[PDB]
Structure 1
């Protein structure tokens, strides 16, 4: 299926079945999306919700986070694991306070220059909060695209990662980008799961190569040897 059909199908799915109501999806701002995405990167949504709420209550703005002692941040993080994320979160908040006047930056380069924020997270922050036209490529999205398009290789190989970014760019619209990127993450989290994907529930099932061949276990490739 052509890229414009992929987009349309994902957006139609999101409208009827998507996750739209989580706390970081209401009255979205760059700060809220960044905080949530950092929390979500290594933690499931159900675990994250109470931490996001406690963080937003304690730190309503990025300057509040910046000005807090690191030990208080780490205390509030306790139980999320992967504390390098918290150390970077705090440093990034301080960079936003120091370099950007306390206003979370709204341009890609400046977002991507923050500690703890890579190309995909920067694209997520600006597409979800502001509708800027950037694609994403987290683990979940890699799996959806690798299955749909039979990307056999290990995404730890630069050439393979680049192929996946190209595919993501190709399917990602400008109109509705906030909805499409959330939908792709939702699909990878809840439908196109690591094991035994729920293809009958997937809006891509009519063009996905893995579904056609029952070969989801091949994609993405795993690390060699």
Structure 2
């Protein structure tokens, strides 16, 4: 029904000619392939490249990552977003070392069991690093296959991904699965792009039903994103006479987990300075707050923070208890802060000067 060999030949030959020389493509070490694949989840290649180089220089082997402190690993991810990815990777490499002696499982079922590894990552790492013929369907590959085969099912449904995986299992080049899987990904990045695909240059134009019917710009089908909640947030920047600043570590469950922040309160529409003073008072801390110096927004995928920054002076009436920490200005650089709170500090320092 489908001329698989003709398709594979046109695809893999194109790939050998156009493949980009990306940093994680220098070899097939499973640890390096796995790190790159996790960083690339909902993150563009050009964004990842500098993070990857810095991460692998700090954590050159799987055992190095496993043996590192969680705060050092989070700092190496700082700014990349979706920070549970790195907490899950860190737990997963620890299990690979403790349990499997440091060798990344080559069994799909075993690799699939590690935290942060789902169907795409299983297929990506095992096909590239070990030759295992598991499909590696990400959103780009879903777009490619939805066009090639004129599939109009919503690609957000998990069932749709399962259908695409079966398609790949039938058309795959079982002789070189890693190259086949990489080539579909590279086709989606360089040719079969979300808007204005370059169908006239495409190596597999011969086999594309969407091109035949003239509807490539209309695939894949995907539900429009649900609007997000708006969340007002009040943030205190508190310094003592010696210049040190009060920061606190977020809880390990939920939004921006285990990152550091300036003390803050979801006002839920209430007065900021009032609610902020109640919260700090609950702790050795005597604090008087200033009028707000700036307000700005910060987007997440699922909500938007509306931040207002309030300066204040801290006088020590007791010890600073966890989760809080008193940090000299010169030491703040050592802590991993979300981008929102990086901006809080930037705005505080511009106002001060």
TM-score after normalising by structure 1: 0.93
Q: Shift of residue 158 of structure 1?
A: 4.2
- CA contact 1:143–1:219 (8 Å) conserved in 2: yes
Q: Shift of residue 5 of structure 1?
A: 2.0
Aligned to 2:199: 199
Q: Shift of residue 198 of structure 1?
A: 1.2
TM-score after normalising by structure 2: 0.61
Aligned to 1:212: 212
Number of residue-to-residue matches in the alignment: 224
Aligned to 1:110: 110
Tell me how far apart the structure 1 counterparts of residues 156 and 124 of structure 2 sit (CA, whole Å): 21
Aligned to 1:4: 5
Q: 1:165 to 1:206 in 2, by over 3 A?
A: same
Tell me how far apart the structure 2 counterparts of residues 54 and 86 of structure 1 sit (CA, whole Å): 14
Q: Deviations over 1:160-201 (max 9, x none)?
A: 222211111111112122211111111111211111111122
Q: Shift of residue 118 of structure 1?
A: 0.7
Aligned to 2:99: 99
Aligned to 1:33: 33
Tell me how far apart the structure 2 counterparts of residues 67 and 8 of structure 1 sit (CA, whole Å): 44
Q: Deviations over 1:32-54 (max 9, x none)?
A: 11000011122211221121111
Relative contact order (alpha carbons < 8 A, sep ≥ 6): 1 or 2 greater? 1
Aligned to 1:156: 156
Aligned to 2:73: 73
The correspondence of residues 97-176 of structure 1 with structure 2, limited to 5 A, is: 97-176=97-176
- Higher-strand-fraction structure: 2
Q: Deviations over 1:15-66 (max 9, x none)?
A: 11122x3221122111111000011122211221121111111111111111
Unmatched 5+ residue regions in structure 1? none
Unmatched 5+ residue regions in structure 2? 227-353
- Higher-helix-fraction structure: 1
- CA contact 1:147–1:208 (8 Å) conserved in 2: yes
Helix, strand or coil: the match of 2:205?
coil
Helix, strand or coil: the match of 2:206?
coil
Tell me how far apart the structure 2 counterparts of residues 190 and 14 of structure 1 sit (CA, whole Å): 11
- CA contact 2:137–2:161 (8 Å) conserved in 1: no
Tell me how far apart the structure 1 counterparts of residues 136 and 5 of structure 2 sit (CA, whole Å): 17
- CA contact 2:92–2:114 (8 Å) conserved in 1: yes
Tell me how far apart the structure 2 counterparts of residues 104 and 187 of structure 1 sit (CA, whole Å): 28
Q: Shift of residue 120 of structure 1?
A: 1.8
